[PDB]
Amino acid sequence: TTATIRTRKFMTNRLLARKQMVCDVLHPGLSSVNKTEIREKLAAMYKVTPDVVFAFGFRTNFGGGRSTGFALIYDTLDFAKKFEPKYRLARHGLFEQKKQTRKQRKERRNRMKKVRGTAKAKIGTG
Amino acid sequence: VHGSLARAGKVKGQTPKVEKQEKKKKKTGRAKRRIQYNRRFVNFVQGFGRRRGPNANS
């Protein structure tokens, strides 16, 4: 139903090479709308093409067809890949990183302590 | 003093425990309490017959 995302609260912040935004999203007689579609629409407003339009905010408000969000739009992909905060890249993931799930590693690290120095020895035990 | 306890729950066993019958599930709060204010106030425009009774049989 035409949507029309028009975005409040602009900040030109060149210290993280990013226009950091609030997104006010209309879909006023339906609701919702996928982040991927939000990037696509927003991309062709600032000319920065969609896989940089890093938008994490969001609450579908009260009873209809508004979501107030935040978008972050990063000038170069190179700067995007540097400030990251890593997990944000991974959601839209060309970046997929390693579940541990962490308490397995802790048990191994405790085993590593016990025996004098070596430490490669008990990588192998682990 | 030491009368006994021999007679314990003779009445609970000799009362036939009259059927639970019902007569209508009375509604939830908003509905029911408004249902009662017909009973108390409007129905109950009260004839001035020197007081009456919610709990009068005959």
Partner: protein, 143 residues
């Protein structure tokens, strides 16, 4: 009439106040910590006790009734209490050597009404409550 109503008499009121509050019955109980010392509850709201015996307590005049109390020994103190079994039939629900909750009768100690020396209530047998059991809403756990 009495009170030292002078400008710098100031100590004397406190001293005399403490001399007068000595007689204050509620403050005696509080300061002397009588709950913990003498009263079978250690100011503790409830006590679990073990049922010794069922007692057929004959009422004070002008009431001739057998009013059905229970001897209870608290787990903390081994202290012997007589507690009343309130609401209907109830000794049949008590059963000797069951674990029973002893609660008081809301009377700042003082024996009930016409019921000799029964400062206490029973609220539960075998962790269910008496109250539930009479109405029939609940059924007694086995043993």
């Amino acid at each position: 009439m009495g009170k030292p109503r002078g400008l710098r008499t100031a100590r004397k009121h406190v001293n005399h106040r403490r001399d007068q509050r000595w007689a204050d019955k509620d403050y005696k109980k509080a300061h002397l910590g009588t709950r913990w010392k003498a009263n079978p509850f250690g100011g503790a709201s409830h006590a679990k006790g073990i049922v010794l015996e069922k007692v057929g307590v004959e009422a004070k005049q002008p009431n001739s009734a057998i009013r059905k109390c229970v001897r209870v020994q608290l787990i903390k103190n081994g202290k012997k209490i007589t507690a009343f079994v309130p609401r209907d039939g109830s000794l049949n629900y008590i059963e000797e050597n069951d674990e029973v909750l002893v609660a008081g009768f809301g009377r700042k100690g003082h024996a009930v009404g016409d019921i000799p020396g029964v400062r206490f209530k029973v609220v539960k047998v075998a962790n269910v409550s008496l109250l539930a059991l009479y109405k029939e809403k609940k059924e007694r756990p086995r043993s």
